[PDB]
Write a protein that binds this ligand. Structure first.
Ligand SMILES: Nc1nc2c(ncn2[C@@H]2O[C@H](COP(=O)(O)O[C@H]3[C@@H](O)[C@H](n4ccc(=O)[nH]c4=O)O[C@@H]3CO)[C@H]3CC(O)(O)C[C@H]32)c(=O)[nH]1
Ligand SMILES: [Cl-]
Ligand SMILES: [Cl-]
Length: 395
């Protein structure tokens, strides 16, 4: 009996069902969301949440776009910050605090990210940070310390690739990976409020990756997630979402390590890109459905719900009181990786929250990165094309 089976039956019996549209395709994130829901549904006399898998996150936002066209939104959905911006154009979203959800104790950063014109429109739910995954066996074999600096990391990847006869730094030629290099080379996406894709730090970041491929230390991963490609060739390092944790753990036929990101200097870890999603509540929802969402959101922000969800997945607990929860404490005591994810979460950058940012990051920025990495397009020429297509789109 799967938790989605148990939820179907809970909702079948319920007098009020609040649909939650999500983009977990499976693994620990889908399971942890459904187990959270099963528990919530059991505490409710005939009031239920129905999680509805919509595919991945981009399938989800396309489904929500169609639901606006059709004029039938769910009660709740996962949303990135740029998706929340796009939804506020449609005036589609309920202010969270007006629902009566108490947000004191939520990570102020995570709260900053969902705050539009001073009003909170989302609940931070499954917020991830990039971390450095590494092959502890391979570093130990060659006496290679975990790199604390970008310079050390490049050196370590060169040294290991030469030793193992293959590129040991594995990356997705995508916007998320580029963000790690761009941010830690001093890059910023907004220059006096203008979106800039082709800044000298963007060229530098894309040039570092393209050179890492040419020099034999970086391996572009073009089919599946990094964690789906493990076992094919020597692997030392990736920079990847904390949500990948359980997937790396299950796949890896080596002792997986997690470290904070290499930074400019030893004074501080690199910044990681914040990913994952916020829950939003749609205005179109009935008052009955809204009240279910209010109680579901208070439940999701409870220390225990956060502790269980975060330790199950490798998401970052969004509340102060989650770290004070004994279930969290007992996992952290046994597994140094949860502290390592939380500590990395102090060094956290966000992509722009422009309504068009989802199209830009995949169709424009993502494509330029692929052109440079996969087709050896000149990094500046690739990014200057991206900057023009973005400017066109935003005009
Ligand atoms: N649609 C849309 N997507 C966006 C936006 N900004 C960022 N992203 C995507 O957020 C994913 C990160 O969110 P996160 O919750 O940290 O991690 C995901 C999965 O990535 C990760 N995962 C899943 C399966 C697996 O085998 N391995 C694994 O690591 O687990 C989670 C749940 O599926 C990136 C990944 C991307 O999908 O390639 C593009 C990025 C946006 O604005 N819109
Ligand atoms: Cl699965
Ligand atoms: Cl992608």
């Amino acid at each position: 009996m799967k938790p989605e089976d148990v939820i179907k039956e809970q909702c079948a019996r319920a007098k009020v069902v609040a649909e939650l549209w999500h983009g977990f395709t499976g693994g620990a994130p889908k399971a942890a969301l459904e187990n959270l829901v099963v528990e919530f549904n059991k505490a409710q006399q005939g009031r239920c949440v129905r999680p509805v898998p919509q595919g991945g996150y981009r399938d989800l936002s396309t489904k929500i776009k169609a639901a606006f066209a059709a004029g039938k939104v769910p009660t709740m959905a996962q949303a990135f910050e740029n998706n929340i911006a796009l939804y506020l154009e449609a005036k589609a979203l309920l202010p969270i605090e007006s629902l009566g959800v108490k947000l004191q104790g939520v990570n102020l950063t995570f709260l900053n990210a969902v705050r539009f014109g001073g009003v909170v429109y989302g609940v931070p739910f499954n917020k991830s940070i990039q971390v450095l995954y590494y092959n502890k066996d391979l570093l130990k074999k060659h006496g290679v310390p975990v790199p604390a600096t970008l310079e050390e990391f490049v050196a370590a990847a060169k040294k290991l690739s030469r030793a193992e006869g293959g590129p040991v730094y594995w990356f997705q030629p995508d916007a998320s990976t580029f963000a790690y290099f761009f941010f830690n080379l001093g890059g910023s996406y907004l220059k006096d409020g203008k979106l800039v894709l082709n800044s000298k730090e963007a060229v530098e970041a894309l040039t570092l990756l393209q050179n890492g491929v040419k020099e034999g230390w970086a391996k572009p991963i073009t089919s599946g997630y990094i964690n789906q490609n493990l076992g094919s060739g020597p692997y030392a390092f990736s920079v990847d979402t904390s949500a990948g944790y359980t997937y790396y753990l299950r796949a890896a036929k080596f002792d997986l390590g997690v470290a904070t990101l290499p930074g400019r200097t030893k004074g501080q870890p690199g910044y990681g890109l914040v990913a994952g999603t916020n829950l939003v509540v749609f205005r179109q929802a009935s008052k009955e459905e809204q009240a279910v969402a209010k109680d579901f959101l208070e439940f999701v922000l409870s220390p225990r719900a956060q502790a269980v969800f975060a330790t199950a997945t490798g998401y970052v607990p969004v509340t102060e009181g989650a770290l004070k929860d004994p279930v969290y404490q007992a996992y952290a005591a046994e597994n140094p990786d949860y502290a390592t994810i939380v500590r990395q979460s102090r060094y956290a950058k966000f992509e722009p929250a422009l309504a068009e940012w989802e199209q830009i990051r995949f169709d424009i920025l993502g494509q330029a990165i692929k052109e440079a990495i996969l087709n050896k397009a000149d990094p500046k020429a690739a990014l200057d094309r991206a900057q023009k297509l973005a400017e066109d789109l935003l005009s």
